[PDB]
Write a protein that binds this ligand. Sequence first.
Ligand SMILES: [C-]#N
Length: 106
Amino acid sequence: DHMQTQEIISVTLQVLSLLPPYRQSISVLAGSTVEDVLKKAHELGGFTYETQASLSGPYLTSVMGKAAGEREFWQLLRDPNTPLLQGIADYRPKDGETIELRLVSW
Ligand SMILES: [C-]#N
């Protein structure tokens, strides 16, 4: 029906731009967004982050207490080393995917 998936998937959320690195397998409903994964990692796995409103949805500004500085941003990637084409509130990871948040300068 127009109800929710029921099948639970596992998405690995990893942050290698920090010491110690963050890596946790997160269980969400199939169809959850990256933002949903962050929320669940926050609820259960001591993950913190900040966003701010944008014209194209929430923009990720800080991860695990580390804010992006000048000419820097938290890049969203799926394994292997592949930037996402959508932001956190749009991309819906598949079962077994690894989502990486990487602090990069431009
Ligand atoms: C935006 N790239």
